[PDB]
Coordinates of C-alpha atoms and ligand atoms in Angstrom, one line a residue:
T1 CA -0.3 21.3 -14.1
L2 CA -1.3 17.9 -12.7
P3 CA -3.8 15.6 -14.4
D4 CA -7.3 15.7 -13.1
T5 CA -7.6 11.9 -13.0
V6 CA -4.9 9.2 -12.4
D7 CA -5.3 5.5 -12.3
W8 CA -2.1 3.5 -12.4
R9 CA -4.1 0.3 -13.2
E10 CA -4.5 1.8 -16.7
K11 CA -0.7 1.9 -17.1
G12 CA -0.2 -1.7 -16.1
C13 CA 1.5 -0.7 -12.8
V14 CA -0.8 -2.4 -10.3
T15 CA -0.9 -6.2 -9.7
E16 CA -3.9 -8.4 -8.9
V17 CA -5.7 -7.8 -5.6
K18 CA -4.4 -10.0 -2.8
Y19 CA -6.2 -11.6 0.2
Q20 CA -4.4 -11.2 3.5
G21 CA -6.7 -13.5 5.5
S22 CA -6.4 -13.6 9.3
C23 CA -2.7 -12.4 9.3
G24 CA -2.1 -8.7 10.1
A25 CA -0.1 -8.2 6.9
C26 CA -1.8 -5.1 5.5
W27 CA 1.5 -3.2 5.9
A28 CA 3.4 -5.8 3.9
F29 CA 0.8 -5.8 1.0
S30 CA 0.9 -2.0 1.0
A31 CA 4.7 -2.0 0.8
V32 CA 5.0 -4.6 -2.0
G33 CA 2.3 -2.8 -3.9
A34 CA 4.2 0.4 -3.9
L35 CA 7.4 -1.4 -4.9
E36 CA 5.6 -3.3 -7.7
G37 CA 4.6 0.0 -9.2
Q38 CA 8.2 1.3 -9.2
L39 CA 9.4 -2.0 -10.6
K40 CA 7.0 -1.7 -13.5
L41 CA 8.0 1.9 -14.1
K42 CA 11.7 1.0 -14.1
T43 CA 11.8 -2.4 -15.8
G44 CA 8.6 -2.6 -17.7
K45 CA 7.6 -5.8 -16.0
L46 CA 4.6 -6.2 -13.7
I47 CA 5.5 -8.8 -11.0
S48 CA 3.7 -9.5 -7.7
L49 CA 6.4 -9.2 -4.9
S50 CA 6.5 -11.3 -1.8
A51 CA 4.5 -10.0 1.2
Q52 CA 5.5 -13.2 3.0
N53 CA 9.2 -12.3 2.6
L54 CA 8.5 -9.2 4.5
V55 CA 6.4 -10.9 7.2
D56 CA 9.0 -13.6 7.9
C57 CA 12.2 -11.6 7.6
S58 CA 11.5 -8.2 9.4
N59 CA 9.8 -9.6 12.5
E60 CA 12.3 -8.2 15.0
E61 CA 13.0 -5.0 17.0
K62 CA 15.5 -3.7 14.5
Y63 CA 12.5 -3.0 12.2
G64 CA 9.6 -2.9 14.8
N65 CA 7.5 -5.1 12.5
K66 CA 5.7 -8.1 14.1
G67 CA 4.8 -10.3 11.1
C68 CA 1.1 -11.2 11.3
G69 CA 1.0 -8.9 14.4
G70 CA 1.2 -5.8 12.2
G71 CA 4.0 -3.5 11.0
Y72 CA 5.0 -0.4 9.0
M73 CA 5.5 0.2 5.3
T74 CA 8.6 2.4 5.8
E75 CA 10.2 -0.4 7.9
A76 CA 9.4 -2.9 5.1
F77 CA 11.2 -0.7 2.7
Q78 CA 14.2 -0.4 5.1
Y79 CA 14.3 -4.2 5.4
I80 CA 14.5 -4.4 1.6
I81 CA 17.3 -1.9 1.5
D82 CA 19.3 -3.6 4.3
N83 CA 18.6 -7.1 2.8
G84 CA 19.7 -6.0 -0.7
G85 CA 16.4 -7.4 -2.2
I86 CA 13.1 -9.0 -2.1
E87 CA 11.7 -12.1 -3.8
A88 CA 8.6 -12.5 -6.1
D89 CA 5.4 -13.9 -4.8
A90 CA 5.9 -16.8 -7.2
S91 CA 9.1 -18.0 -5.5
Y92 CA 8.1 -16.9 -1.9
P93 CA 4.3 -17.3 -1.7
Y94 CA 1.9 -16.1 0.9
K95 CA 1.1 -18.3 3.9
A96 CA -0.8 -15.9 6.1
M97 CA 1.3 -17.0 9.1
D98 CA 4.7 -16.2 10.6
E99 CA 7.4 -18.4 9.2
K100 CA 11.2 -18.7 9.4
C101 CA 12.9 -16.4 7.0
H102 CA 14.1 -18.2 3.9
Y103 CA 15.1 -15.3 1.6
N104 CA 17.5 -16.4 -1.1
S105 CA 19.3 -13.8 -3.2
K106 CA 19.4 -16.0 -6.3
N107 CA 15.6 -15.4 -6.3
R108 CA 15.8 -11.6 -5.9
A109 CA 13.1 -9.9 -8.1
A110 CA 13.4 -6.3 -7.0
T111 CA 15.5 -4.0 -4.9
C112 CA 15.0 -0.8 -2.9
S113 CA 17.6 2.0 -2.7
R114 CA 15.7 4.5 -0.6
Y115 CA 12.2 5.7 0.3
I116 CA 10.5 9.0 0.5
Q117 CA 8.0 10.2 3.2
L118 CA 5.5 13.0 2.3
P119 CA 4.6 15.8 4.6
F120 CA 2.1 14.8 7.3
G121 CA -1.5 15.5 6.3
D122 CA -0.6 17.1 3.0
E123 CA -3.1 16.0 0.4
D124 CA -1.6 18.3 -2.3
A125 CA 1.7 16.5 -1.8
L126 CA 0.0 13.1 -2.1
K127 CA -1.7 14.2 -5.3
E128 CA 1.6 15.3 -6.8
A129 CA 3.3 12.1 -5.7
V130 CA 0.6 9.9 -7.1
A131 CA 0.6 11.8 -10.4
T132 CA 4.4 11.9 -10.9
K133 CA 5.9 9.0 -8.9
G134 CA 3.5 6.1 -8.8
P135 CA 1.3 4.3 -6.3
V136 CA 1.9 5.5 -2.7
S137 CA 1.7 3.5 0.5
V138 CA -0.6 5.2 3.1
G139 CA -2.2 4.5 6.5
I140 CA -5.9 5.0 7.0
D141 CA -8.5 4.7 9.7
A142 CA -10.2 1.6 8.4
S143 CA -11.7 0.7 11.8
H144 CA -15.4 1.6 11.1
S145 CA -17.9 -0.9 9.9
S146 CA -19.0 1.5 7.1
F147 CA -15.6 0.8 5.5
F148 CA -16.8 -2.8 4.9
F149 CA -20.4 -1.7 4.1
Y150 CA -18.9 0.3 1.2
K151 CA -19.6 -0.9 -2.4
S152 CA -19.5 2.1 -4.7
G153 CA -19.3 5.9 -4.6
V154 CA -17.0 7.9 -2.4
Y155 CA -16.4 6.8 1.1
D156 CA -16.8 9.8 3.5
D157 CA -18.1 8.5 6.8
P158 CA -18.2 11.3 9.5
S159 CA -17.1 8.8 12.1
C160 CA -13.7 8.4 10.5
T161 CA -10.8 9.8 12.5
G162 CA -7.2 10.7 12.0
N163 CA -6.1 7.7 14.1
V164 CA -4.9 5.3 11.4
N165 CA -4.7 1.6 11.7
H166 CA -4.3 -0.1 8.3
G167 CA -1.8 0.2 5.5
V168 CA -3.2 0.4 2.0
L169 CA -2.1 1.6 -1.5
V170 CA -3.2 4.8 -3.3
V171 CA -3.2 3.9 -7.0
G172 CA -5.0 7.0 -8.3
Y173 CA -7.3 9.9 -7.8
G174 CA -10.1 11.8 -9.5
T175 CA -13.6 13.2 -9.0
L176 CA -16.7 11.0 -9.0
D177 CA -20.1 12.9 -9.4
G178 CA -18.5 16.1 -8.1
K179 CA -16.7 14.5 -5.1
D180 CA -12.9 14.3 -5.1
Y181 CA -11.5 10.8 -4.2
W182 CA -8.4 8.8 -3.7
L183 CA -8.4 5.4 -5.4
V184 CA -7.3 2.9 -2.8
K185 CA -6.2 -0.8 -3.4
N186 CA -6.8 -3.0 -0.4
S187 CA -5.7 -6.6 0.5
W188 CA -9.0 -8.2 1.3
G189 CA -9.6 -9.8 -2.1
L190 CA -12.0 -9.0 -4.9
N191 CA -15.0 -9.2 -2.6
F192 CA -14.0 -6.1 -0.7
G193 CA -15.4 -2.8 -1.9
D194 CA -15.5 -2.4 -5.7
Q195 CA -13.4 -5.4 -6.9
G196 CA -10.9 -4.9 -4.1
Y197 CA -10.8 -1.1 -4.3
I198 CA -12.4 1.8 -2.3
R199 CA -12.7 5.4 -3.4
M200 CA -12.0 7.5 -0.3
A201 CA -12.8 11.2 0.2
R202 CA -10.0 13.5 -1.1
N203 CA -9.5 17.2 0.0
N204 CA -11.8 16.8 3.0
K205 CA -9.3 17.9 5.6
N206 CA -7.2 14.7 5.6
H207 CA -10.2 12.5 6.1
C208 CA -9.5 9.1 7.8
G209 CA -5.9 10.2 8.1
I210 CA -5.2 9.2 4.5
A211 CA -2.4 11.8 3.9
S212 CA -0.9 11.5 7.4
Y213 CA 1.7 8.7 6.7
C214 CA 2.4 8.5 3.0
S215 CA 5.6 6.9 1.6
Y216 CA 6.9 5.3 -1.5
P217 CA 10.1 3.4 -2.3
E218 CA 12.7 3.9 -5.1
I219 CA 14.2 0.9 -6.8
Ligands
LIG301 C1 -3.0 -4.6 8.9 N1 -3.5 -5.7 8.6 C2 -2.9 -4.1 10.4 N2 -2.3 -2.8 10.6 C3 -1.0 -2.6 10.6 O1 -0.2 -3.5 10.5 C4 -0.7 -1.2 10.9 C5 -0.2 -0.4 9.7 C6 0.5 0.8 10.2 S1 -0.5 2.2 10.1 O2 -0.7 2.5 8.7 O3 -1.6 1.9 10.9 C7 0.3 3.5 10.9 C8 -0.1 3.8 12.2 C9 0.4 4.8 12.9 C10 1.4 5.6 12.4 C11 1.8 5.4 11.1 C12 1.3 4.3 10.3 C13 1.9 4.1 8.9 F1 3.0 4.8 8.7 F2 2.1 2.8 8.6 F3 1.0 4.5 8.0 C14 1.0 0.4 11.7 N3 0.4 -0.9 11.9 C15 -4.0 -4.5 11.3 C16 -2.6 -5.2 11.5

């Protein structure tokens, strides 16, 4: 049986909330956030990993990422696999602009061997993965102003669609005042939502596309 409530923050598997700025790096923050969870679960250390390393070094057709022009979490993971590593934020900090790649293997702080994609639209599979694997990268439709109006409760705007546009991180789930939710870490700083997080409707027919494109890496 799966736990009724999960919050990876409580297990020290989630780093501080980041601020992407004007750079379209949501995908990179979502990817590093999933890998940070796995790194903590394997090594016992909680380390912020370099979103900028992803932005600078996978901006080419091989990956179909475009740096600050947007990208995909699974292609971030594929880069880390191909590259044999990724740096920590501390040695490769965030600039919110495209830069020339300067990855250095002496500063490797994590690796990725493979990644897993969950079945499209399957919220039961997402629940199982969050409970048993760790934080999971997902895409959502975050294109409605109500997403930024949100401060507390469970986000469930009827104007959401299945047409996703932003990569974020699912770090838990539960039920709040009788409404099932996913606990989502964003990359808009602490001023977004509830200290950087939004609780999004769970079990409402794949609302906002949250279970359409779920993936997580393995160290
Ligand atoms: C983030 N600041 C911005 N969005 C992106 O870079 C997006 C993330 C992904 S997605 O989540 O929207 C996505 C769309 C369609 C199919 C699959 C996905 C997946 F797999 F990533 F979830 C694509 N670009 C605004 C730049």
